[PDB]
């Protein structure tokens, strides 16, 4: 009992389809370091996001493929976390310590920047303008040195912006680079995006990815550094070995002699060697991919706003919008708002169209009543020309309730009384009421749809097994059957840890089952995952 | 404590009229609908404060002339000369009054900033008056549902 | 109501076979059973 209780956390079990059609159970070992890195909370957040996008956003057909991609990405991220955990060489090691500190404290810098922006805006609240010397914009308050305090706050804010930029560059970009290299390698190995096929003209990313085809450092940040050789051996006969070599930037004789025997080079002694070791085309492609990231562009905008705030102190008020991306519920409510942004802009365009039609008819017939001047001898009409009539309607009639007719003169006492009444009533009902009703309903329906999405994801996960797909009703025949099955038999963490265990274990040490699973991982065949069957289902007659 | 204070001043007993909210069950149901998203509502009004503040900054920087709220020309009473009074003016008047902040402001026509003031007023009307109160309404409706 | 109509149509098509009417659960006993059945065995284009 004591041994089992001690090795319970380390003992992990999974189920596979197996070479024979009978479902089989595999027991392996889970490392303590692996479990700790898995229980890292960022891993939990990534798992939640992956589950949400694999349930709500479809992808059931490619469920196992997405799961395997998620496992690979998480392994890469936790390797990064392990690395960044707590003369020329001296400066280099000091630099790596600084970068590691920034990587570990990246989020705290973001929160500190938000607080700094709040403080700067609070100080700017006390501004005033005058004509006499302190026009003049001055910070007026009783206690002095407040302007020096604001200067110090601004300097600290920009220094923190630098730290956030460096932390993002050193923490988040490698995952994006890894994903892009993996996608490119898969495309040019299996689908042959560039061999026996050509990217489309609309594929801007496809055209941009053509740069790293010949660069020597193409397989950087990705487990496989032999993708070029594999593609050569796969498409050499059809496309031509020389053509493949020219496309991929390889040397046949060089690779052959390295396959036979190679020597060991010397480590870079100084900085000039690193300078000459820069691959310009690969770096340009890396810049091209990194600058397309939305978060990097937002951080650059933050930094540019801080630099402009140095020029003019009021530019720091733009950083108050950072709460929208900092606080999560801000993101939720603005996701509700932006879920139908195209709907809203198209609605306001339709509003512009109908208001334009009302301007045309009012210009044609209702010109007299648009006098907006109290002096009769100096009339100021706002519908004499089409431009001013359209501007008047847009600016005044839409904003003011009751339609356009409120600003217009009294229709009574003329021959067009009924026509003007119909005009005003139609404007009020079609512009003021119906269109703003659409505006309200779009937002309300967005809230409802997002709530329904979260509820659907939660219900689906609570009802169905993720790996097998069998409903909870079959397992709940036995007490706590579903709880046992989704925690002991088929566990996402268990499959992840088995993948890591296969990666770590030597090839000659793999047992029959481990080798049988391994071959398939490499051949990208997802048949070991038990879909529609389980150990209990197979051995119900034998009582498991 | 409210009853004891009502002994001191008779009008303090009016606070006991809110006891119906906790006495009548359907009062509790409707106020549960109201308070189911209380954090949502307070965070929405905070966001309203933030955006109104940004509009105050831009109006102070450029639209200072048009905020004269005095009928006497010889005694002008501007409400955006300083940041505090401009923010207070926007918060108190523009949010409550329909049609955006531009209704109280002077006529943009006849100046070089006509288009800029038109864009300012239209953006204020669409983002503050319409969208945010739409969120306020939708939160309560979704809570009932 | 319109959003519910679109969602209902999508869910019905994703769940039930159009020609047979048998639910996807019976076919999904075998891996990719529904995907095989709605693309190889009973296909609207095939009947056309
Ligand atoms: N094969 C499976 N592996 C894991 N969970 C499964 C599986 N099949 C179904 N589930 C369901 O997925 C649900 C997800 O819960 P989970 O264990 O991830 O919670 P948690 O660890 O508390 O979450 P969080 O990510 O918020 O920390 C489980 O409650 C379980 O019912
Ligand atoms: N007998 C059937 N024939 C065809 N589809 C069926 C049948 N029974 C059920 N279905 C379902 O109908 C769905 C309709 O998808 P379909 O194959 O028409 O997509 P598509 O060709 O991508 O669509 P689109 O018309 O937008 O180009 C399928 O995904 C399938 O699950
Ligand atoms: C299949 N596979 C991986 O998925 C992998 C890996 N190293 C890291 N990962 C994620 N190796 C060596 C591997 O063979
Ligand atoms: Ca062996
Ligand atoms: Zn299962
Ligand atoms: Zn069928």
Answer whether B86's CB lies under 8 Å from A124's CB: no
For residue A208, with 0-12 CB atoms within 10 Å meaning exposed, 13-18 middle and 19 or more buried, which class applies? middle
For ligand 3, the distance from its centroid to the CA atom of residue A181, given in whole angstroms, is: 14
Chain C residues touching residue A538 (CB < 8 angstroms): none
Torsion-angle region of A124 (φ positive above 0: left; ψ -120 to 50: alpha; else: beta): alpha
Provide φ and ψ at A139, rounded to 5°: -85, 105
User: For testing the chain C interface, which of A531, A537, A538 should be mutated: the one with the most C CBs within 10 Å?
Assistant: A531
Q: CA B111 from chain center: how many Å?
A: 29
Partner-chain contact A323 B50, CB within 8 Å: yes
Cβ–ligand 1 contact at A465 (below 6 Å): yes
Rounded to 10 degrees, what is the CA torsion of A444, A448, A449, A451?
Answer: 140
Partner-chain contact C30 A469, CB within 8 Å: no
How far apart are the CA of B144 and the nearest CA of chain A, in angstroms?
11
Answer whether A16's CB lies under 8 Å from A23's CB: yes
Partner-chain contact B125 A399, CB within 8 Å: yes
For residue A94, with 0-12 CB atoms within 10 Å meaning exposed, 13-18 middle and 19 or more buried, which class applies? exposed
DSSP, res A321: G
Answer whether A17's CB lies under 8 Å from A528's CB: yes
Please tell me the experimental approach by which this structure was elucidated: cryo-EM
DSSP, res A27: E
| Nearest atom, ligand 2, residue C34 CA | 31
Partner-chain contact A445 C3, CB within 8 Å: yes
**Greatest CA separation for chain B:** 64
Cross-chain CB nearest to B83 (options A125, A318, A327): A125
- The Cα A278–Cα A515 span in angstroms is 40
Q: What is the distance between the terminal CA atoms of chain C, rounded to a whole angstrom?
A: 33
- The Cα B128–Cα B54 span in angstroms is 12
A14-to-A28, A438, A494, A538, C1 alpha-carbon distances in Å: 8, 52, 6, 15, 45
Chains that touch B (3 or more CB pairs under 8 A): A
For ligand 1, the distance from its centroid to the CA atom of residue A491, given in whole angstroms, is: 9
How far apart are the CA of A127 and the nearest CA of chain C, in angstroms?
51
For ligand 2, the distance from its centroid to the CA atom of residue C47, given in whole angstroms, is: 14
Tokens standing for residue A169: 């560059």
For residue A395, with 0-12 CB atoms within 10 Å meaning exposed, 13-18 middle and 19 or more buried, which class applies? buried
Q: How many CB atoms lie within 10 A of CB A182?
A: 19
Residue whose entry in the numeric block shows the structure tokens 């070991």: A528
Nearest to A529, CA basis, from A109, A18, A28, A122: A18
- The Cα B68–Cα B73 span in angstroms is 9
Give, for B28, the enclosing helix (H) or strand (E). helix B25-35
B64-to-A488, B59, B83, B85, B113 alpha-carbon distances in Å: 69, 6, 11, 12, 12
Cross-chain CB nearest to B141 (options A125, A399, A444): A444
The partner residues of A462 in beta bridges, in order of sequence, read none
A293-to-A180, A239, A253, A322, A409 alpha-carbon distances in Å: 12, 35, 39, 17, 55
Q: Give break positions in chain C: residue before each, C–N beyond 2.5 Å.
A: none
User: Taking CB atoms and a 6 Å cutoff, what residues make up the pocket around ligand 3?
Assistant: A 72, 75, 223, 503, 521
Answer whether A38's CB lies under 8 Å from A493's CB: yes
DSSP codes, B78-107: BS-SSHHHHHHHIIIIITTSTT-GGGTSPP
- The Cα A480–Cα A477 span in angstroms is 8
- The Cα A207–Cα A199 span in angstroms is 7
- The Cα A161–Cα A308 span in angstroms is 13
Interface membership of C6 toward A (CB under 8 Å): no
Resolution (A): 3.3
- Closest residue in C to A445 (Cα) is C3
Rounded to 10 degrees, what is the CA torsion of A326, A328, A333, A335?
Answer: 80
Q: How many CB atoms lie within 10 A of CB A171?
A: 19
DSSP, res A136: E
| Nearest atom, ligand 1, residue A44 CA | 25
Residue whose entry in the numeric block shows the structure tokens 């274990």: A505
Tokens standing for residue A318: 């733009």
A283-to-A278, A286, A288, B102 alpha-carbon distances in Å: 8, 5, 9, 51
Tokens standing for residue A359: 């301007």
Partner-chain contact B82 A127, CB within 8 Å: yes
Strands A136-139, A127-130: pairing is antiparallel
For residue A161, with 0-12 CB atoms within 10 Å meaning exposed, 13-18 middle and 19 or more buried, which class applies? buried
Q: How many residues does chain A have?
A: 544
- The Cα B66–Cα B113 span in angstroms is 11
- The Cα A514–Cα A506 span in angstroms is 11
- The Cα A216–Cα A278 span in angstroms is 11
For ligand 1, the distance from its centroid to the CA atom of residue A5, given in whole angstroms, is: 23
| Nearest atom, ligand 3, residue A76 CA | 10
Spell out the SS3 assignment of A141-166.
CCCCCHHHHHHHHHHHHHHHHHHHHH
Instruction: Calculate helix-pair angle for A436-463, A341-365, nearest 10 degrees.
Output: 170
Ligand 2, atom 17: nearest CA belongs to which residue? C39
The partner residues of A130 in beta bridges, in order of sequence, read A136
A18-to-A512, B37, C30 alpha-carbon distances in Å: 10, 51, 15
Residue whose entry in the numeric block shows the structure tokens 């060991």: A264
- The Cα A31–Cα A500 span in angstroms is 10
Q: How many residues does chain B have?
A: 145
C17-to-A44, A460, A503, C48 alpha-carbon distances in Å: 38, 21, 42, 16
Collapsing DSSP states into helix, strand and coil, what is residue A346? Answer: helix
DSSP codes, A238-302: HH-HHHHHHHHT--HHHHHHHHH---------SHHHHHHT--HHHHHHHHHHHTT-HHHHHHHHH
List the Cα angle A158/A322/A457 in 5-degree steps. Answer: 140
């Amino acid at each position: 009992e004591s041994i089992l209780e001690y090795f319970r956390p380390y003992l992990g079990r999974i189920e596979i389809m197996g070479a024979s059609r009978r479902i089989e159970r595999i027991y392996f070992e889970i490392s303590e370091t692996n479990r700790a890195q898995w229980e890292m909370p960022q891993v939990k957040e990534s798992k939640r996001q992956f589950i949400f996008d694999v349930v709500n956003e479809g992808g059931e057909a490619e469920k196992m493929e997405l799961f395997v991609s998620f496992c690979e990405d998480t392994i890469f991220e936790m390797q990064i976390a392990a690395q960044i955990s707590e003369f020329w060489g001296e400066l280099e090691v000091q630099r790596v310590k600084f970068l590691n500190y920034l990587s570990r404290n990246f989020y705290t810098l973001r929160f500190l920047a938000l607080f700094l922006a709040f403080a700067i805006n609070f100080i700017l609240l006390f501004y005033k303008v005058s004509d006499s010397p302190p026009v003049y914009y001055f910070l007026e308050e009783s206690t002095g040195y407040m302007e020096p305090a604001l200067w110090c706050l601004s300097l600290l804010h920009t220094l923190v912006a630098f730290l956030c930029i460096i932390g993002y560059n050193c923490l988040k970009v490698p995952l994006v680079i890894f994903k892009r290299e993996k996608e490119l390698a898969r495309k040019l190995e299996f689908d042959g995006l560039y061999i026996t096929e050509q990217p489309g003209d609309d594929d801007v990313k496809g055209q941009w990815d053509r740069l790293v085809l010949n660069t020597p450092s193409f397989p950087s940040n990705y487990w496989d550094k032999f993708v070029k050789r594999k593609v050569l051996d796969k498409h050499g006969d059809i496309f031509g070995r020389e053509r493949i070599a020219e496309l991929l930037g390889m040397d046949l004789a060089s690779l052959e002699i390295t396959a036979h025997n190679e020597r060991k080079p010397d480590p870079p002694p100084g900085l000039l060697t690193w300078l000459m070791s820069i691959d310009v085309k690969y770096q340009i492609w890396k810049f091209g991919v990194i600058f397309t990231d939305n978060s990097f562009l937002y951080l650059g905008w933050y930094m540019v706003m801080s630099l402009l705030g140095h020029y003019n102190n009021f530019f720091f008020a733009a950083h108050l919008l950072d709460i929208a991306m900092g606080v999560k519920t801000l993101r939720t409510i603005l996701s509700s708002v932006t879920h139908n942004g195209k709907q809203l802009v198209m609605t306001v365009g339709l509003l512009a169209v109908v208001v334009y039609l009302y301007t045309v008819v009012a210009f044609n017939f209702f010109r007299k009543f648009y006098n907006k001047s109290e002096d009769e001898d100096e009339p100021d009409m706002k519908c004499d020309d089409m431009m001013t009539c359209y501007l008047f309607h847009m600016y005044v009639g839409v904003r003011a309730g009751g339609g356009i007719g409120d600003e217009i003169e009294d229709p009574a006492g003329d021959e067009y009384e009924l026509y003007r009444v119909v005009f005003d009533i139609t404007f009020f009902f079609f512009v003021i009421v119906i269109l703003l009703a659409i505006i309200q309903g779009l937002i309300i329906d967005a809230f409802g749809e997002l709530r329904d999405q979260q509820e659907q994801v939660k219900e689906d996960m609570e009802t169905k097994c993720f790996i097998c797909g069998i409903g909870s009703d079959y397992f709940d025949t036995t007490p706590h059957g579903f709880e046992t099955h989704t925690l002991e038999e088929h566990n996402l963490a268990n499959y992840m840890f088995f993948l890591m265990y296969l990666i770590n274990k030597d090839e000659t040490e793999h047992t029959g089952q481990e080798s049988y699973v391994w071959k398939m991982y490499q051949e990208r065949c997802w048949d070991f995952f038990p879909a529609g069957d389980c150990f209990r289902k197979q051995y119900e007659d034998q009582l498991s």
